[PDB]
Nucleic acid binder design. Structure first.
Lengths: 183, 62, 49, 148, 107, 52
RNA sequence: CGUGGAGGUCAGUGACGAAGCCUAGACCGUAAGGUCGGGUCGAACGGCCUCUAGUGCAGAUCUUGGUGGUAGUAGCAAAUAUUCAAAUGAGAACUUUGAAGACUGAAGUGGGGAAAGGUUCCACGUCAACAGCAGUUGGACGUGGGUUAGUCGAUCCUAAGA
């Protein structure tokens, strides 16, 4: 439990959480950044396309020393990849998200990802060997993924927070004079 | 599933190396179930495993 | 029986985090190397190639 | 998950063209202070459970083979008796039910002793069958009463 | 639409200037891609006889002009991809030249 | 206790490129091999001016 | 001014939440600091007069523990090497079989052994941990089976030696 930022009522939204999955944390982070702010089915077809290896996941944070692609122009960046393992893991995550959304029976036609969260996990520390018998670390970067999906509703057009006007005596007199003269 | 054990046992009971054992992909349930020397003997009598005798090493030009 | 299986599955978690080969592997690690953190590499008989 | 109808107590319309079996067993009630429950308790054959004034120990003799599992064993006698019981129908049977001299054309004791000398090997092979998974023991129940 | 149209293939078109070590794997990849482009499917399967024919001359000596045929088959049930399916099959000819693509009627 | 902070056989390894001069217990595979002792700046070491 | 403890004192504070912790929230002191409000918290804790000390860290190539950037970079390049089909399987460049190609070329990558290794041999179910990659596989995991000497070696004898 203890989900992250849920800027909405759970009664009109769904949540999914995956923990302790052996995935590249940085690739998971960039994929999550790409995914967020979209719609469920649109993201589904996008990740299917990524698995089909025609579109690419862009690079936002850890985007150094990466070869150029011929298709980064879609999002305006020149760094992109196809992280298959994280791709299929987020495939499963979004799939179970949609499944539990159907189970709770809210309108799936207007479901879009509201919040995403990718965070680090306790490192897996192997033991490798180097020159002259040195012992160093072999650290994996396991991740934790959290998704909060919401159905887009209609915004309320009401404008609250009406200001209260305070005017000096001279200003009130000027306003009264303008009222009596504007005829 | 796994057939290396059956192949090794058949090779040993026949008396030839484990590379000289033939199997039928069409009929595999019986050979999978078989795990005894009597079973291997009866199936090779049935003819499901061939001997695939030694390759030709001619000496005519010599 | 299911409770015991669950207990074993949970208990193996710490060794999995430690990346030990199993419940039996306990190969420790030395903090520093005598042959890698001492000596003066002057002319003549070198410390090592 | 059991592939049974689980007492479909609603539909029992009797229709022709078939056969039926009616088997009723009733348990007497001795002097009991109040009503309780009557059930069946299995019987082992190891004598290592406990000691009671009315504890029964016996080895069941009825056995059946589940044809679903196919496997081979490691004894000539076991193979022979497995094939013989395969020839025999799929129903509970006793070891003595297998005998080349079973019909007993004439009553005497040489036939009996030959039957026993065959039954020794048959019992050994049956023990091998039980040691592997190629048979099921026939449970023996005792009606015992426990207050609610 | 189950069809059978025996095509012709030359290896020299797509195996020129490639590493001697991977001549046969390159031939296999080019053959499957050629079938893909000339059919328009997603699933392509090769024939053991064709594998024997391509490897038979040698690992680094595959013959140039090989005759093959492509068969469309409807995929079995519970196939989430499509009914489309291509299967290749070799056939030997007396002379490599003098032949062109010919559709063979089902019989 | 007087014997406290004394059941060690640490020796200094001398001036080093990236190792301090605090004596450290020798050997290998002990876990503490290469850790300082006998001093108030080391784990489990003796206390400055023991309360006699 | 601050901290661990002791003696008294405030018929001291405390499950209507004490200590601890976070806080671009509010006050006081020139300051070390103190008080309060707010959030989590679940069991003890302060002011006043003295006494007592293992009592106040930014460092010492300080010790222990934890984690960063360099970075998804270097790299995963000796031994000439793999291909297709089928089956299992949620999932197959690597598991099994079949169909091909290969190499070791008998001072072998074979067949035995000696030191050493000590259950790794093998069977069955199973793959979170490992086989830097995946593993449906294993020299991995869990449960069991298996070595039969009047003739093989020790035990018998002796050398340089003790």
């Amino acid at each position: 439990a203890r989900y992250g930022a849920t800027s909405t009522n759970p009664a009109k939204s769904a949540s999914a959480r995956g923990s302790y999955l052996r995935v590249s944390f940085k690739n998971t982070r960039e994929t999550a950044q790409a995914i967020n702010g979209w719609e469920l089915t649109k993201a589904q077809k996008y990740l299917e396309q990524v698995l089909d290896h025609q579109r690419a996941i862009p690079f936002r944070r850890f985007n150094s020393s990466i070869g150029r692609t011929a298709q980064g122009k879609e999002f305006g960046v020149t760094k992109a990849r196809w992280p298959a393992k994280s791709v299929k893991f987020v495939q499963g995550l979004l799939q179970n998200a949609a499944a539990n959304a159907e189970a709770k029976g809210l309108d799936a036609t207007k479901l879009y990802v509201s919040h995403i969260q990718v965070n680090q996990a306790p490192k897996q520390r192997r033991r490798t060997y180097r020159a002259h018998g040195r012992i160093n670390k072999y650290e994996s970067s396991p991740s934790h993924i959290e998704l909060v999906v919401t159905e887009k509703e209609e915004a309320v057009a009401k404008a609250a927070e009406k200001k209260v006007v305070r005017l000096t005596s001279r200003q009130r007199g000027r306003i009264a004079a303008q009222k009596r003269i504007a005829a | 599933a796994n057939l290396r054990t059956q192949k090794r046992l058949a090779a040993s009971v026949v008396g030839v190396g484990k590379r000289k054992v033939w199997l039928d992909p069409n009929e595999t349930s019986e050979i999978a179930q078989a795990n005894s020397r009597n079973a291997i003997r009866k199936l090779v009598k049935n003819g499901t495993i061939v001997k695939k005798a030694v390759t030709v090493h001619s000496k005519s030009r010599t | 029986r299911s409770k015991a299986d669950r207990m074993a599955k949970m208990e193996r978690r710490e060794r999995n985090r430690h990346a030990k080969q199993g419940e039996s592997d306990r190969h420790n690690a030395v903090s520093l190397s005598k042959h890698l953190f001492s000596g003066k590499r002057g002319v003549g008989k070198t410390d090592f190639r | 998950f059991t592939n049974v109808s689980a007492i479909p107590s609603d539909d029992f319309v009797v229709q022709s063209g078939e056969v039926y079996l009616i088997d009723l067993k009733m348990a007497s009630l001795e002097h009991c202070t109040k009503k309780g429950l009557v059930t069946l308790e299995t019987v082992d054959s190891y004598t290592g459970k406990s000691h009671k004034a009315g504890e029964l120990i016996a080895r069941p003799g009825a056995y059946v083979r589940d044809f679903a599992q196919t496997h081979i064993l490691k004894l000539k006698t076991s193979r022979q008796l497995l094939t013989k019981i395969d020839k025999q129908g799929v129903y509970p049977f006793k070891l003595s039910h297998l005998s080349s001299n079973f019909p007993f054309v004439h009553e005497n004791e040489e036939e009996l002793q030959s039957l026993k000398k065959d039954l020794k090997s048959f019992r050994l092979g049956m023990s091998e069958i039980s040691n592997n998974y190629l048979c099921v023991e026939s449970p023996i129940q005792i009606a015992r009463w426990v207050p609610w | 639409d189950v069809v059978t149209r025996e095509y012709t293939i030359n290896l020299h078109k797509r195996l020129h200037g490639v590493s001697f070590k991977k001549r046969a794997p390159r031939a296999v990849k080019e053959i499957k891609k050629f079938a893909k482009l000339h059919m328009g499917t997603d699933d392509v399967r090769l024939a053991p006889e064709l594998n024997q024919a391509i490897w038979k001359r040698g690992v680094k000596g595959v013959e140039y002009r090989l005759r093959l045929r492509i068969s469309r088959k409807r995929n079995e049930e519970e196939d989430a991809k499509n009914p489309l399916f291509s299967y290749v099959e070799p056939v030997l000819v007396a002379s490599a030249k003098g032949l062109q693509t010919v559709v063979v009627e089902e019989d | 206790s007087e014997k406290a902070g004394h059941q060690t056989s640490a020796e200094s390894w001398g001036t080093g490129r990236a190792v301090a001069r605090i004596p450290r217990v020798g050997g290998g595979g002990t876990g503490r091999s290469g850790q300082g002792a006998f001093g108030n700046m080391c784990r489990g070491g003796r206390m400055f001016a023991p309360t006699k």
